[PDB]
């Protein structure tokens, strides 16, 4: 049995918008520490990791532990029906193939109930080791989204180059090439500098999280996946992982 109420349902809505153009089915891990989701996309080339800590739900009760197999697509059409100012409660009989979703509102006048079936889902979890990356780049999440859109008109892979006082972005295609250089304000923290290439198609799904945070942080190291993180204030985060190109 799990029940969880959220005063800022605003967020769930956006979480699901993030997750939804990337993966269609996933598995929600529910515990008393909170709500966790790990999923790769269908190519096993990116992966998304979601955490919504119990201490952030304006009401939390996980009774026993619980893995809910969910069509994110379905779920996305449901959270789209939530008003933006709506209080979103979740609830799940401690098994039965069905998760429940309540949208209360401002002046307690309208109340929306949706029940979505769920799914025996045999999905595959990876263990990501604890580590720290050579380069940690912090930038305004907006600035990063438009960067990936811009360069994505030029080419389809981006070359990210980290250095003491700045980071660079480069692409090239049958049109020419282009290069975007940002430099310490946009923050860097770096042991050894880095240079990898990543596929914009996936980056450009990641920035769909952009409304969750005003900042985004990428982490890198030689010949290992990029980490793209968004801090969901007071509450947890969305990491995307992307394997480097080549």
């Amino acid at each position: 049995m799990f029940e969880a109420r959220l005063v800022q349902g605003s967020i769930l809505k956006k979480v699901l918008e993030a997750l939804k153009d990337l993966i269609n089915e996933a598995c929600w891990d529910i515990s008393s520490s909170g709500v966790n989701l790990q999923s790769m996309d269908s190519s096993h080339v990116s992966l998304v990791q979601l955490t919504l800590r119990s201490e952030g739900f304006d009401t939390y009760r996980c009774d026993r532990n619980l893995a809910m197999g969910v069509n994110l697509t379905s779920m996305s059409k449901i959270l789209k029906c939530a008003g933006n100012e709506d209080i979103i409660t979740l609830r799940a009989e401690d098994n039965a193939d069905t998760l429940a979703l309540v949208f209360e509102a401002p002046n307690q006048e309208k109340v929306s109930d949706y029940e979505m079936k769920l799914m025996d889902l045999d999905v595959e979890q990876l263990g990501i080791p604890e580590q720290e990356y050579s380069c940690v780049v912090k930038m305004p999440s907006g600035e990063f989204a438009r960067i990936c859109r811009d360069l994505s008109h030029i080419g389809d892979a981006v070359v990210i180059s980290c250095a003491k006082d700045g980071v660079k972005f480069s692409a090239s295609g049958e049109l020419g090439n282009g290069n975007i250089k940002l430099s310490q304000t946009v923050t860097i923290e770096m042991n050894e500098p880095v240079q990898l290439t990543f596929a914009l198609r996936y980056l450009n799904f990641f920035t769909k999280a952009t409304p969750l945070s005003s900042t985004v942080t990428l982490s890198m190291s030689a010949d290992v996946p990029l980490v793209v993180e968004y801090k969901i204030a007071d509450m947890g985060h969305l990491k995307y992982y992307l394997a480097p190109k080549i």
């Binding site: 190519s43 096993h44 263990g127 596929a199 996946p225 992982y241 394997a243 480097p244 190109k245």
Partner: peptide, 20 residues
């Protein structure tokens, strides 16, 4: 048939071994 995979990358499984 060759299972479709975007050109030029590895699975994450080659980087993060799956739980078991």
């Amino acid at each position: 048939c060759k299972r479709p995979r975007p050109e030029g990358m590895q699975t994450l499984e080659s980087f993060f071994k799956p739980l078991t």
